[PDB]
Amino acid sequence: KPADSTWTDDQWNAIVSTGQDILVAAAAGSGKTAVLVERMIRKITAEENPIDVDRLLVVTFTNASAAEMKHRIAEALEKELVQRPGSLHIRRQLSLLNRASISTLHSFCLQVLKKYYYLIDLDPGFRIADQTEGELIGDEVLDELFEDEYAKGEKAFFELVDRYTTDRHDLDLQFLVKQVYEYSRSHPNPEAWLESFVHLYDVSEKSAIEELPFYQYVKEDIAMVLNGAKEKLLRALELTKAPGGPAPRADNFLDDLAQIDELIQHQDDFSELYKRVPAVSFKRAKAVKGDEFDPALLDEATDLRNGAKKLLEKLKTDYFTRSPEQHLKSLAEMKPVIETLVQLVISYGKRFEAAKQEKSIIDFSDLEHYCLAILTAENDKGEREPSEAARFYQEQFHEVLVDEYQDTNLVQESILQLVTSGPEETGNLFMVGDVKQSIYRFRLAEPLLFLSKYKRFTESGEGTGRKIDLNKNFRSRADILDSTNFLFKQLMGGKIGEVDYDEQAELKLGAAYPDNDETETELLLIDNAEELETVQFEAKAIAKEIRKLISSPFKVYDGKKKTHRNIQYRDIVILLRSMPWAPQIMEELRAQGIPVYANLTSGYFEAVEVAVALSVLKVIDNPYQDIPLASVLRSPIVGADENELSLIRLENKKAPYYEAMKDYLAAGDRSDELYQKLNTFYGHLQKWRAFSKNHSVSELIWEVYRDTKYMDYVGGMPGGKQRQANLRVLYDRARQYESTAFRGLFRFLRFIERMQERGDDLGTARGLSEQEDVVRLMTIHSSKGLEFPVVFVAGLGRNFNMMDLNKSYLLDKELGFGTKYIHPQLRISYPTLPLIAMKKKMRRELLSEELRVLYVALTRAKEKLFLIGSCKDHQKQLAKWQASASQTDWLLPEFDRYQARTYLDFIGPALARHRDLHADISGHPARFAVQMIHSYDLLEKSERLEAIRRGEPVPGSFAFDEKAREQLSWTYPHQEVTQIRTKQSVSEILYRRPAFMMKKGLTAAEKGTAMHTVMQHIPLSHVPSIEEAEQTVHRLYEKELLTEEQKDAIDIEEIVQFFHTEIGGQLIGAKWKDREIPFSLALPAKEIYPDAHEADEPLLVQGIIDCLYETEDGLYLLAYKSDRIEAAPILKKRYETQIQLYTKAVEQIAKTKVKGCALYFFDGGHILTL
């Protein structure tokens, strides 16, 4: 149904369209997420047939994006609630929003495991391990496996080890297995992918190179460099035509061309290239002499020709220093080694899973894979049949919505395909995303998955899935869109970038912004001309410009609905590729009053407070560690100086430092200051020592802080806020780890130690929350899907992380495991053809993604964009930038873009042809502000202070003196009774052996209670005989009021004797009788405790009176005792206070007097009166 709105027709299309799988493809800021939300809201708040929120699955990959969707859905939902406050449905939905399935796909996976644990080998009470504890378990099993393999001593294992390890140790093989395993975990069927390794090595001498899959990437490479060389020479040829240009060398170049063209005719024949490429020679350059030739032009042509040479020699050394037959031979020779690796990795995985199952924990990886295992019933090589659980979720979910779909790998796609209902042609899958923002190649998130569906689908929803393009941007000012577009028309292509940045793909203005004078995109290039790391210079430039934006106020347009907002620090955001630069940036920005926030994951353990507090914990665990002990002693916790330290050492040179400390204490006199330090500390040590064995780690930590005031102290030194923060999270992290698998000091410390020992870290604590008004530093990945008024992008001169390209092996999704030929005995190694192939493939895949990463970064901005980078020399780099940009096509040369190592190698030459640094290119509506910054340009006595140093009060009068004084002297009026237990027992006013270790029953208490039961149950109408007593006992045995052993432990004579007594007779003959009388009595606390108060609550004393009877004389109390006798003054005082309690209870509560009390003892039938 068509409806009037603010929505674009394409958007409305995506909101209302239904009936099949739907894919919405659109550039950044198009409203893809907005549309997803509104689609939901419309499905929920409908009049005809509304659905509940829990009938939708709304999934994304990142926790942040899921938080965003959750946020938008909530807002929109209650917004709809305002419009119709009467509906029960909408309020119901706002309640259900808690139980709604709106999260990460991993969170959903957790839900699946929790419900359907019984379908797989999983404990219902399973827990998700954290990174380090999981990886530690992995380390253990890997060590165990390796030892087992060394024990077997199989030749193949040694053959593998010898090749992928050093001459001294085998750690590299360890890292290899870890890496291969981890990579395999991104495939829907890891072991199958591993088992597909060898097919790459299954060649022979009779094979044809060009018919092998990997050769594809070889084929491309050659084609690119040869053409790249041709393209170079042609320019050297065109330069011969220029007025200054050197005419003669034309005949040289045309020869070279003819040779290079000769190579191009045989690009598809590798075996022919092997003959021709190493046979190519460029004839000696003809000398051009005279003043007719431009010098620069001569040199320029020379440079280009030499470029061609280099390209060929690189090509030759890469592929043609070995015959194709030899390449195939080395490859095939490597096959057995690969098989051993595969079986090794497979064993590790199996053993690894076993280890985790034992401790009932799982990876993040186990989330996806176990979820997939649950959702499948039958699995025929990819064809997965939905199990019962899958069918449940298919029914439960009416539609599955996926945002940022370009981050979906094949595993997640498997899961979605199992939870969706119907085929593609009639499914309930709704996905939005953008191939240009595909930036998770390390997760095997494939652009190909998006692109395939996009090519299969049609704009009409007939016969297949429906695809919907959105062209309009509603997020940024035209400054940003234009700078972006101008940059990526020149950088992102199909070859490098993997995406054609055509007109359909360009950003198109659709948001109305009242112009500003300074909104032009800035480029700050910093130089190293004429002891600060370059990140610091960069950070200075950032901070300077930020304060420039603060000094001249900035205007923030709430274009969504019409209102201005003054710029807050909140509005500015710094984006980085990676966070190792972040701390040094934060320090400099904090040093300039600019509030900074950043979610860090490293640097925690190098903070001195942490090293110190940890040292304390270690010393408490084991004082016989010289370095932690010395650390604690020298720390402000004790404050021993270097002299006092060496003084401790002098008492005992050979022994441990702890021994020496003990000796100093043993010999020192209590008048020494050093003695006092050490004695106080030692007392604390012993106290903490005892403490930790009875309390948790966290209680210990707080107690340490309490006794040392180290956290307080640390709050008073430079960086106090951060330091106190660090100690605080030491406590909280102790809390979490205690609760998980590392309870107790020894286990905790061992965990921390093992964590650091394998290079794992934790982030420094944070002070200001993310919500607060702060400049946020974050990764470009984290920012995906979000928007900010101002955006800095820093570290553009930083090299791309290309470490993977330099190892002896390489992992490839398509091709598997490529490696060098290695011979452990011959001591030689060289790359095989598939290794080179994969290296080329990987390089261009990496560069493509880095390009996309940049696109995400630049498209984050709403109004302002800053590009900051660093180089050695301005002029030299500008020369390099212009020497690539003379071409008139938008897209820069493939080979040149392929050669990029930093972001500036991209942005540079793309910016060169601009006016600010062909009316189509230079007359682009893009405005760039270039600053060519240099590194260098970016860079008493107080009465109270001395009063504080002297330990003296500051002189003066202050408004809060009297109140501070009174509050610090205050004590709680009722302090004394705060620890007094309310409830008290009459008694109040042994480590037993187990049952199965002792003889058969019949104890004193047993028999005593067994008699007491009879006394309270024997009829009191008349005096009973032995027979009647035995009869009562028997009835109590058949009512199960008395166990068999209880029954047999009865002295009938002893109880019958009581009824022959005087008190017993008077009991039988009474007006009124009662037994087993429960009572509670309220005694004012002063009576039991001195210092109580009339206001202070009474204590409650509780007990049970055995018997009470009333005659014509008064009320009498009776109690039974099984006390050993066969003694009267002793028993009298033994129960005196108890009897007084009973009497006072009766007197006070019943408001009646009590005349005479009696205690009957079964042994000998004694009766004493009180």
Partner: protein
């Protein structure tokens, strides 16, 4: 618990506390782990550190120290498994020198005795438990084994003593919980044998059941006192006559709480079972709806005052969102101001900063921070100057003074006094080029290393220096053997190189790093690797000898000490003398027209050579010293 301890607020928790921190439970669990994992390091010392194995009536502090040193020994020597139970006396050496002799010292003997004496009371009760347990087939006899293990080690008496120590120190609540622990354990065992006593079960499952049962164990409720704050929950807690109520953590997902569908029957199951007439417990939908009643009862529980608070961030910094009831409250009371709660007093009014000064410790804590902030040119409230002055008028102003000395804290070191330094390094500094290089890197590092002799904790692990010593000593052995057989490096064949390298490494392997090269199959291979290296090196040296005019005069030629060459002496103005002693790797002589020529060759396990810059700054001084 902690915060209210600090602010001196008495409380009662409407909830029982876990026993999992008690020494008894950990003793039982870790003992079972000692049996199951075959005496792993972590299990054994988890067990020992609970101190219930400690010899009766021995000084806890002393026993502790002895255990500590045994622990360091077990880490250093990789002690695990039947190595504990075999009886083979633990042997102890202080220093690793491949050249030196094995012979022990007085100290090393004394130490070895101490280590073994500690071992001999640690192993038997544990080993006996391992015996009985293997023998026991049914649940009851394993329970019998465990209990007798507790009884033989005198656990009841140790607990009793502990309890009395706690009572004496006024920690009565902590004192009762020991008996509670024993009784819980005994009950657990009792029920175990009552249900499954005669059934034959495996150690694995027996440990599983003991573990689960222990994981459930809980201490009794602390009995209420006459005057405490009641801290409890919102579904079970009951109160009467409440005047002021603080409702905590009004966060989204927490209050109202997301229901837990954990259980065998799902919401759909319960719903459908409800439709067929079966009434079970509530479902997620219903519980989530009933949350409003719970909230209502909480909000309407006090008579005078109601506070509703919520945190915006978790302890890790992650954002926490307000629950809907905060907005609901803003609606019902639109002119009510929301209060801020922060530990940064400079963000609230003076009057609100004054509320922070509740006692000496808290006031000290905050005053320190405020003083720092003040030195950052912030006009801190007068609250804190008043607070400061009171703290300085107090009788123990010295403690606060020490606290506020943090204001002027810089990591300063005091230069050593003449007497002390002289006494520490001695009258005559006996050192090596290595030591001088350390000093040139950082004087403090030299102080910690050669002044305070701070040793780092040793591990059963093959590091680079040890390998280096192996290489050096190996080449030496081969060299001496070559002179013995009238052979020269030139006259070595491939077969000979391999044989000599193998034999040399073989000799040195037992001496290196507490026999670690013999400790595993993985290490056997490391050993073979090292042998391959020595072999190739022998070959290379052989080739070089055939092409050099230099002949080695001396190999591992010691200077100073008691070796051939005399030391390099220096006269220091204090009268203190500095003597540098060591060992040159190789010295070569060669005749020439210029005269006699000497060169120095060093065997390095690295690729780089000599940096003249490092020589200038005294970081690389060995080679030129040897040449000198």
């Amino acid at each position: 618990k902690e915060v209210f301890a600090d602010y001196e607020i008495p409380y009662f928790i409407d909830g029982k506390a876990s026993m999992l921190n008690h020494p008894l439970i950990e003793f039982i669990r870790s003992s079972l782990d000692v049996l199951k994992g075959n005496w792993r390091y972590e299990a054994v010392f988890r067990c020992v550190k609970t101190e219930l194995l400690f010899p009766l009536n021995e000084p806890k502090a002393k026993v502790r120290e002895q255990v500590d040193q045994l622990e360091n020994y077990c880490i250093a020597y990789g002690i695990k498994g039947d190595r504990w139970t075999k009886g083979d006396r633990f042997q102890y050496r202080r220093f690793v020198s491949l050249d030196d002799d094995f012979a022990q010292t007085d100290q090393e003997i004394e130490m070895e005795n101490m280590l073994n004496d500690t071992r001999d009371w640690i192993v038997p009760p544990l080993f006996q438990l391992q015996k009985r347990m293997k023998k026991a087939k049914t649940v009851q006899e394993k329970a019998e084994a465990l209990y007798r293990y507790l009884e033989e080690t005198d656990v009841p008496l140790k607990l009793d003593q502990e309890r009395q120590r706690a009572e004496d120190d006024g920690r009565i609540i902590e004192a009762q919980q020991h008996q509670q622990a024993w009784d819980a354990v005994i009950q657990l065992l009792e029920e175990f044998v009552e249900m499954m006593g005669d059934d034959e079960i495996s150690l694995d499952l027996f440990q599983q059941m003991i573990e689960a049962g222990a994981e459930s164990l809980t201490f009794s409720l602390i009995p209420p006192a006459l005057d405490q704050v009641f801290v409890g929950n919102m579904d079970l807690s009951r109160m009467y006559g409440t005047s002021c109520t603080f409702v905590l953590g009004a966060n989204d997902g927490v209050l109202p709480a997301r229901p837990d569908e954990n259980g065998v029957l799902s919401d759909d199951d319960r719903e459908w079972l409800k439709t067929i007439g079966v009434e079970l417990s509530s479902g997620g939908r219903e519980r989530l709806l009933d949350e409003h009643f719970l909230i209502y009862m909480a909000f309407s529980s006090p008579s005078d005052r109601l506070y509703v608070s919520y945190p915006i961030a978790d302890a890790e910094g992650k954002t926490l969102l307000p629950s809907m009831i905060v907005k609901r409250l803003e609606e019902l009371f639109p002119h009510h101001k929301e209060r801020l709660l922060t530990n940064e007093p400079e963000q609230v009014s003076d009057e609100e900063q004054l509320m922070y000064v509740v006692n000496k410790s808290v006031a000290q804590s905050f005053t320190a921070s405020q003083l720092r902030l003040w030195t950052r040119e912030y006009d801190i409230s007068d609250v804190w100057w008043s607070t400061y002055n009171v703290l300085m008028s107090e009788q123990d102003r010295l403690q606060s003074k020490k606290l506020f000395s943090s204001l002027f804290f810089r990591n300063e070191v005091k230069q050593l006094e003449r007497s002390v330094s002289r006494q520490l390094y001695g009258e005559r500094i006996q050192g090596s080029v290595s030591r001088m290089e350390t000093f040139n890197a950082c004087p403090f590092s030299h102080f910690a290393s050669h002044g305070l002799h701070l040793k780092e904790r040793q591990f059963f692990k093959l590091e680079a220096p040890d390998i280096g010593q192996l290489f050096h000593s190996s080449l030496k052995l081969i060299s001496d053997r070559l002179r013995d057989e009238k052979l020269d490096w030139r006259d070595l064949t491939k077969e000979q190189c391999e044989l000599f390298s193998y034999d040399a490494v073989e000799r040195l392997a037992p001496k290196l790093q507490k026999e670690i090269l013999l400790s595993s199959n993985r290490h056997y291979y490391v050993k073979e690797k090292l042998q391959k290296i020595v072999t190739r090196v022998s070959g290379i040296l052989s080739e070089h000898a055939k092409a050099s005019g230099f002949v080695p005069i001396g190999l591992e030629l010691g200077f100073g000490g008691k070796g051939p060459l005399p030391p390099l002496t220096f006269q220091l103005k204090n009268g203190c003398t500095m003597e540098l002693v060591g060992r040159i790797d190789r010295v070569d002589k060669a005749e020439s027209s210029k005269g006699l020529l000497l060169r120095i060759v060093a065997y390095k396990s690295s690729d780089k050579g000599l940096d003249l810059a490092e020589v200038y700054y005294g970081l690389a001084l060995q080679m030129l010293t040897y040449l000198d």
